[PDB]
Amino acid sequence: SGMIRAIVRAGQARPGPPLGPILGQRGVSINQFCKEFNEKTKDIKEGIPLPTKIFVKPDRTFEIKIGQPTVSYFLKAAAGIEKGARHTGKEVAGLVTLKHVYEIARVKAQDDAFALQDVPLSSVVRSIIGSARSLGIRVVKDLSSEELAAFQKERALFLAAQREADLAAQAEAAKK
């Protein structure tokens, strides 16, 4: 049939949409695919997403190729923030270091793309920096003793006031 790209959790591969109807239209079974995915990712921490490529042949057979987990997830974990910032560039989401960026590059280099591309770790580090700046996370050179918490308290106050203002604006739009 061809190639299908998917991003599912480690062990939370349920046979429903938005994954069910795709393989259903293709022809292969959904429960079988879920069983294969769970037995192949049973050692993975349940809850993290990782990209997968499903190659379906004309005889309704399928092969799976799993890559390293999502770089967005890696950056959100390294920063300690669950959901990234809304207004990128205008607000600060988290705080990571070049050490953490190099670590993420080292743990993500062993993937299909960076295996086919003979690139040094500098390219992967630059890509991680780009993804972090897209998420809105600042990357300081070397500053982590308490500044992380000093910014974390202010970020918590900011997100609390942001949620309050969102609820207020929603109530205002409902009343208008």
Partner RNA sequence: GCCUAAAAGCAGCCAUCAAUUGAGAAAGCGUUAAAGCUCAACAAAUUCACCAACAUAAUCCCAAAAACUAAUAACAAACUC
Strand partners, 64: 54
116 binds other proteins (CB under 8 A): yes
Number of residues that bind other proteins (CB under 8 A): 4
Residue 61 CB neighbours (<10 A): 11
Should residue 98 be labelled a site residue for RNA when binding is judged by CB under 7 A?
A: no
Beta-strand runs (E) in the chain: 2-9, 49-56, 62-66, 95-97, 138-140
Burial pattern 48-58, b for ≥16 Cβ within 10 A else e, equals bebbbebebee
Measured from the CB atom, is 39 or 107 closer to RNA?
107
Residue 10 CB coordination number (10 Å): 20
From residue 129 to residue 148, what is the string marking binding to RNA with x (rule CB under 7 A)? xxx-xxxx------------
In the bound state with RNA, the residue whose beta carbon lies nearer, of 39 and 157, is 157
How do 138-140 and 95-97 pair as beta strands? parallel
Choose, by CB under 7 A, the member of 50, 85, 95, 105 that binds RNA: 85
Report if residue 115 touches RNA, rule: CB under 7 A: no
Q: Smallest distance, Å, CB 58 to RNA?
A: 15
Choose between 32 and 117: whose C-beta lies nearer to other proteins: 117
Give the residues lining the site for other proteins (CB under 8 A): 115-118
